[PDB]
DNA sequence: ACCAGACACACATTC
DNA sequence: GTTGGGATTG
DNA sequence: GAATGTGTGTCTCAATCCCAA
């Protein structure tokens, strides 16, 4: 705010950060920008970045008036000269549509349209045919007295941005979001060499299956985009993850399209985690039995997760059918306890959760509405230091919500010496003052696991006296086996009776939901160590 | 935290 | 004359 | 009719402004 080219200091910010750590990942012509921006003068950097920052690429004079940068057509001029903007760019119809108003539209192509009133995008479908090639301004309409400028530079801008975050899903309003205190970030002292990528090589791997989503989400025939995607595993976790990641949502798009055949062959290229699960129903969609029950079989001598086990556990007996063989007998498992209710008649327009809460409301119990949200803020504030660890890798700039290596498979282990230091405070004392002083530190901070808005003052030290420790034992425990896998399934509702200092947690189901299967997963898990759990049926 | 997951809801299918 | 979606704002 | 499987709608800062309705 108090700086009118905040945007362009933000930038340039960027850039001397680029410089900085990623020197030997640039190339030669990507050099040369950064080098000939700096040289610029001050109100045609301005200019430049407002155009790389707004959503097009394309221009209008008259959309790019600003106060600080003055006059733009002589701003532009710098940049017209080294051809990173172009005045009289070609335009398709459907690019000039986006320019262009509406009424403007109806002039130009008057003689080609009716006296009837049809909306922009259905006069942009009639035209389309009739206008099929692209042509310059002048070409489209000589009367045209606006310049339109086209950005071209933007790619070169997108892996700048791409190697400042370690993603492009961030842009650059964090700096501003940032500024103004709408996002408060933890602020991870990390080395002055660390790194969002290592190396180039994988920076274009990250872009090349990136624009691979995006052909696929324009509707490009998979047939091609398949052989666009790479035939051996990437060398880089992070980029395995994605092209197996990319992998399983093709094998989504064909199975849906009822091409069962091309799902499975696809589903078993991948290693996302419930992609050979997918494989096998796929299998059984094509009415290929004998093929899904070796693999099931194979699946439930060594399953991925408890998740494909349960999964397992429907498709093995339905195969077996299918198949010559007898089901063996699925005897369940022990069952949590179980509490109804008479479909009680609604107020007015209300949810079945917020309603239970109310009728569960008690002098001594208080009841609470926090799924997930409670247990992952406890175990978020406990292992603050843990989660928040200047492990060489974790951090790599600002605005950093979580550790970049928090899906990683030994996220545990490169801080297991801090987890066993903080949940070691579980079992002395200092627990329930460790987690005040966090709360009262670390309030707002973005965080992977703290739900701030919901974890009031009262909820708080209302479960520090009743949640036993040992019992935040075995919950923290059991999301270190696996977070993306454990950070919900979570039931609904918490119920405190703080006087006598006992919890009961319950998840309501009204007349048009059941049980998932992680929640599922998770009632099993508190029954077996003897956890107050039920699930209220309404 | 690296391009959504999470959940409640709702309507098919299959012995 | 009003309303809603989206983009450009900080 | 149970047990299942699959398929939807919703939600990521908030006041301003241009444009389509």
Known sequence: ????????????????????????????????FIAAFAELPEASQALLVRMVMRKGTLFREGKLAYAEIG??????????????????????????????????????????????NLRKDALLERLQPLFPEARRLAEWQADFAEPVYELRCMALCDRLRLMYFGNLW?????????????????????????????????????????????????????????????????????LEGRRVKLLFQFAQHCEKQRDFDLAQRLYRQSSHPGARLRAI?????????????????????????????????????????????????????????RLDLCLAFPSEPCSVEWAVREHLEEPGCA????????INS????????????????????????????????????RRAALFEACLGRLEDGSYRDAIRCRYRDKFGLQSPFVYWELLGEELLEQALDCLPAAHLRAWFERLLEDIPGNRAGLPDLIQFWPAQRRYRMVEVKGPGDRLQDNQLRWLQFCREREMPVAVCYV
């Open 378 to 413: 406890l175990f978020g504030l406990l292992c603050w230091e843990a989660i928040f660890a200047a492990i060489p890798g974790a951090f790599f700039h600002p605005f950093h919500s979580a550790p970049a290596d928090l899906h990683s498979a030994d996220f545990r282990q």
């Open 170 to 238: 961030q842009d650059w309003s964090e700096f501003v979001l940032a500024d103004l205190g709408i996002y408060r970030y933890e602020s991870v002292e990390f080395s002055a060499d660390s790194r969002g990528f290592r190396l180039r090589a994988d920076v274009d791997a990250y872009l090349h299956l990136f624009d691979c989503r995006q052909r696929f989400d324009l509707g490009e025939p998979l047939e091609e985009l398949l052989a666009g995607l790479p035939g051996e595993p990437y060398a880089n976790p992070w």
């Open 281 to 337: 129903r796929s299998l059984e969609r094509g009415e290929r039995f004998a093929e899904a029950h070796a693999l099931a079989r194979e699946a439930s001598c060594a399953p991925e997760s408890d998740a494909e086990r349960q999964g397992l556990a429907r498709l093995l007996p339905r195969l077996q059918g299918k198949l010559g063989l007898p089901r063996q007998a699925r005897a369940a498992a022990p069952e949590i306890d």
């Open 71 to 116: 006059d733009t057509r002589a701003a532009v001029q710098p940049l017209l000269a080294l051809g990173w903007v172009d005045a009289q760019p070609t335009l398709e119809l459907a690019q000039l549509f986006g320019l262009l108003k509406k009424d403007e539209l109806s002039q130009l192509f008057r003689d080609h349209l009716g006296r009837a």
């Open 1 to 32: 705010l108090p700086e009118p080219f905040y945007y362009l200091h933000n930038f340039r910010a960027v850039l001397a950060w680029i410089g900085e750590r990623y020197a030997d990942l640039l190339d030669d012509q990507e050099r040369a």
């Open 367 to 374: 009841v609470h509405y926090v799924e997930n949200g409670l």
